[PDB]
Amino acid sequence: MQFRSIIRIVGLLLALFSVTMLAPALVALLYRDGAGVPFVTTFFVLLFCGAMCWFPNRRHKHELKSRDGFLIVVLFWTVLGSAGSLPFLIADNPNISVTDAFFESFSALTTTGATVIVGLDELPKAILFYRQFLQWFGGMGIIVLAVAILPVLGIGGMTPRIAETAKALWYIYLSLTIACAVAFWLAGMTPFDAISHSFSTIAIGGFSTHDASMGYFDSYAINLITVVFLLISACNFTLHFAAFASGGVHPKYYWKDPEFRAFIFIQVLLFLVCFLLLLKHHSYTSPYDAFDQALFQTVSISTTAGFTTTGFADWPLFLPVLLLFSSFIGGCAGSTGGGMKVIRILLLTLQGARELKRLVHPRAVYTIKVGGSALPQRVVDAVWGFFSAYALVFVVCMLGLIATGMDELSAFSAVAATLNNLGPGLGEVALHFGDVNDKAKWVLIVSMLFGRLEIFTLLILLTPTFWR
């Protein structure tokens, strides 16, 4: 099991985390205020803990088989998500509840995007920043996690070299959060509203400074930037490594990957169906606004990002509800997405197809292939075993949220907002957490843990056969 060597990397992360608490405090000094003291408390609070899991240790046992790696990523999200709830807890200045602080933290970390703190428009910019930061960080926590996770769950798609992997990611990540934040600034976003939004935009997070997210400034120019960098960020960073470990070698590098392709078909089709139905029901008086809102939504909520510019005014009930299911897809694998990713669908619809044909030609031998042949005994089994589970989780979560207190259709929209790391409600406009049954807030946090770990990795902790 090698518990020790684990607690050591926990102290490494705890400690490695504290060093972040400064960036927001740097802001409660620079920007106005003076009330970002709860970060400097947190900085010592956690800096201290870290080197107290790591000092009574110093024991690099490397790898340590399957049963360790699982336990690690669970802790990674488990712990650093709990820590995050400290500056909220402490800084009882934009004073929040405890479950609230936890929620607004885990949701911040997991690039989910679900808020319990309202009236954030006028807050301390050290606290406003901390919220966007955790998303930008968690955002990294995923891409490097979706490269050192393939050794386990993410198959069919080390110790001193996994490092020089992420190393590369940092750049793709950094290039984007700047390439964006600048483009956002030219849009006219205050520098702070350009760097705190370009944080939660690459991370498919969903957090905003403004209370009404991208309701923001009605600028088609901003809504055009976001939608672009969502599409980009929502598309698999190992394909970016391809376009940008060389330079102008980008072209067909993308159009050649089928998941990237499939994803593009889905985005065009989804927008089509959404944009056209905005015009059938005359939801806007200017077929331009139709274009604006339709295209933004089918992209932000499709990719499990979570940004919203509409209340869904005269929008046909259909469109949100359709958009609520969209979130079950969105985000190529190895992206910042979160629904059972693009391929898992792509595959699913192929593996299902094979099944109908296997009804007419029960002789012929088909083998599900993407460019060159999946593994119809093995990876095929993994996909539509994951699906089932995904649904089993969803059903238990909704059923536990319904017991917990809150109503039927809401539990529905809540788990759907959480499990796909989406953020908003989206059903029949009932979309606001925070003042939810408190027990329910926990069910919810434990729901977005499932969505981030793609179920198994954490589902397997309950197994009997994971314990020995």
Which residues fall in the annotated binding site for K(+)?
A: 111-112, 204-205, 304-305, 421-422
306 lies in the binding site for K ion (CB under 5 A): yes
Tokens standing for residue 66: 């399957």
Binding positions for its own copies, rule: CB under 8 A: 66-67, 70, 152-153, 316-318, 321-322, 325, 348, 351-352, 354-362, 376-377, 380-382, 384-389, 391-392, 395, 398-399, 402-403, 407-409, 412, 427-428, 456, 459-460, 463, 465-466
For residue 119, CA distances in Å to 122, 207, 423, 426 come to 7, 13, 17, 20
Close Cβ partners of 269 (under 8 Å, ≥ 6 residues apart): none
Residues 173 and 139: beta-carbon distance below 8 Å: yes
- Compare residues 56 and 385 and give the one whose CB is closer to its own copies: 385
Residue 320 CA to residue 285 CA, distance in Å, equals: 20
Helix residue ranges, H only, 251-407:
251-255, 258-280, 287-300, 318-326, 342-360, 379-404
Find which of its own copies, K ion, none residue 192 binds, CB within 5 to 8 Å per kind.
none
- Quote the least distance from Cβ 291 to K ion, whole Å: 23
- Minimum CB separation of residue 403 from K ion in Å reads 26
Cβ 133 to its own copies shortest distance, Å: 33
Measured between alpha carbons, how far is 276 from 291 in angstroms, rounded to an integer? Answer: 9
- CA-angle at 65, arms to 61 and 66, nearest 5°: 135
- Give least dist CB 370 to its own copies, A: 17
Q: Half-sphere exposure of residue 173, counting CA atoms within 13 Å on the CB side? A: 23
Q: Measured in Å, how far apart are the chain's first and last C-alpha atoms?
A: 8
Residue nearest to K ion (CB): 306
Residue number, 302 or 351, with CB nearest to K ion: 302
Per CB under 5 A, 50 contacts K ion:
no
From the list 23, 342, 74, the residue with the least C-alpha distance to 199 is 23
Q: Which of residues 38, 94, 124, 423 is near K ion by CB under 5 A?
A: 423
Distance of closest approach, residue 437 Cβ to its own copies, in angstroms: 12
- Part in contact with K ion (CB under 5 A); list of ranges 98-106, 281-289, 304-312, 362-370: 304-312
Other beta carbons less than 10 A from residue 273's beta carbon: 14
Binding partner of 206, given K ion, its own copies, none, CB within 5-8 angstroms per partner class: K ion
Residue spans of alpha helices (H) in 160-304? 163-187, 192-195, 199-202, 222-233, 237-243, 251-255, 258-280, 287-300
Site for K ion in 88-117 (CB under 5 A): 113
We find the least distance from the C-beta atom of residue 92 to K ion, in angstroms, to be 27
The one segment of 154-162, 180-188, 206-214, 396-404 that binds K ion by CB under 5 A: 206-214
Does 206 sit near K ion (CB under 5 A)? yes
Backbone phi, psi, residue 29, to 5°: -110, -55
Instruction: Return the number of the residue (231 or 459) whose C-beta is nearest its own copies.
Output: 459
Nearer CB in complex with K ion: 57/327: 327
Q: How far is the CB of 302 from its own copies (least distance, A)?
A: 15
389 binds, among its own copies, K ion, none (CB under 5 to 8 A by kind): its own copies
Interacting residues toward K ion by CB under 5 A: 113, 206, 304-306, 423
